[PDB]
């Protein structure tokens, strides 16, 4: 459990440790039918075919075709109507969303600081604990090698 990351400063011993972990692992061995087609169209990954009067490019083919042509007119009048109320302001409704995107963006870069200051406030505390244990383990190892050589000289 206790393994110090700061004070212990090789990639081969990681590869030496990875084999012995593996040698023990070589041993241990809500919607409707809308959910059905949205899965099925994505799995097949094929776009659904679309039919347009303009694409057909057929004029006066018969009687049904004549009805289709009308559809072109009231869409172009409505498009010119939607191009009229877009061209009325045409810069001022677009600029008020650009400032809206600026105030939304700074909040995430505000949240980028509050994590980054707090995550280093975690690592600043553990490193002090990392250096304290290495100090106590050193005096333990210093007293350990002394006793191993004292008892040999005592005998």
């Amino acid at each position: 459990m206790d393994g110090l990351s700061f004070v212990d400063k090789p990639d081969g011993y990681k590869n030496e440790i990875d084999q012995l972990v593996k040698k023990e692992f070589a041993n241990i061995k809500a919607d409707n039918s809308v959910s059905t087609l949205t899965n099925a169209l994505y799995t097949e990954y094929l776009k659904q075919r679309n039919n347009k009067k303009r694409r057909t490019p057929d004029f006066n083919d018969d009687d049904d075709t004549l009805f289709l042509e009308e559809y072109r007119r009231k869409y172009p009048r409505i498009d010119t109507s939607r191009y009229i109320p877009n061209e009325s302001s045409e810069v001022s409704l677009l600029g008020i969303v650009d400032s809206y995107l600026k105030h939304q963006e700074i909040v995430l870069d505000t949240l980028l600081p509050q994590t980054v200051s707090n995550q280093w406030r975690i690592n600043n505390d553990y490193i002090r604990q990392t250096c304290t244990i290495v100090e106590e383990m050193n005096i333990q190892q210093r007293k350990q090698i002394n006793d191993l050589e004292i008892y040999r000289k005592r005998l």
């Binding site: 949205t38 869409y75 409704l93």
Partner: protein
């Protein structure tokens, strides 16, 4: 600025008073109807408790609103949600490989704590 259910920008945001999390009006009221609780913190919430609180620039090329815009909204929803279902099954596979090697390592530590502590004891025994 955002909603805490779908990840949208709400036009009619609502605030619950039990957990301060800004969500959309139809998204908060739908959750309160199905399961009688705040979804975020799992506290009790009603429809009468919540407190009611954007400019979208249309493209100049606005039949595009019928054909080209409508399909891709249902295209980008499906191939993201299908991509997400691959992520959820793959991560639980990566969870099962995280948990197995964790138990594989602790049996090594439990086996090596028995090896080193007896060998250092045998160093204390050899002097005698």
């Amino acid at each position: 600025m955002l909603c805490a259910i779908s990840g949208k920008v709400p036009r009619r945001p609502v605030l619950s008073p039990k957990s301060r999390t800004i969500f959309e009006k139809s998204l908060l009221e739908q959750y309160v109807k199905d399961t009688g609780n705040d979804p975020i913190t799992n506290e009790p919430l009603s429809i009468e408790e919540i407190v009611e609180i954007a400019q979208q620039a249309s493209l100049t090329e606005s039949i595009p609103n019928l054909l080209t815009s409508l399909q891709n909204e249902w295209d980008a929803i499906m191939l993201e949600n299908f991509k997400l279902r691959s992520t959820l099954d793959s991560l639980t596979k990566k969870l099962s490989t995280v948990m197995y090697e964790r138990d594989a390592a602790k049996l090594v530590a439990a086996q090596l704590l028995m090896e080193k502590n007896e060998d250092s004891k045998d160093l204390p025994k050899s002097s005698q």
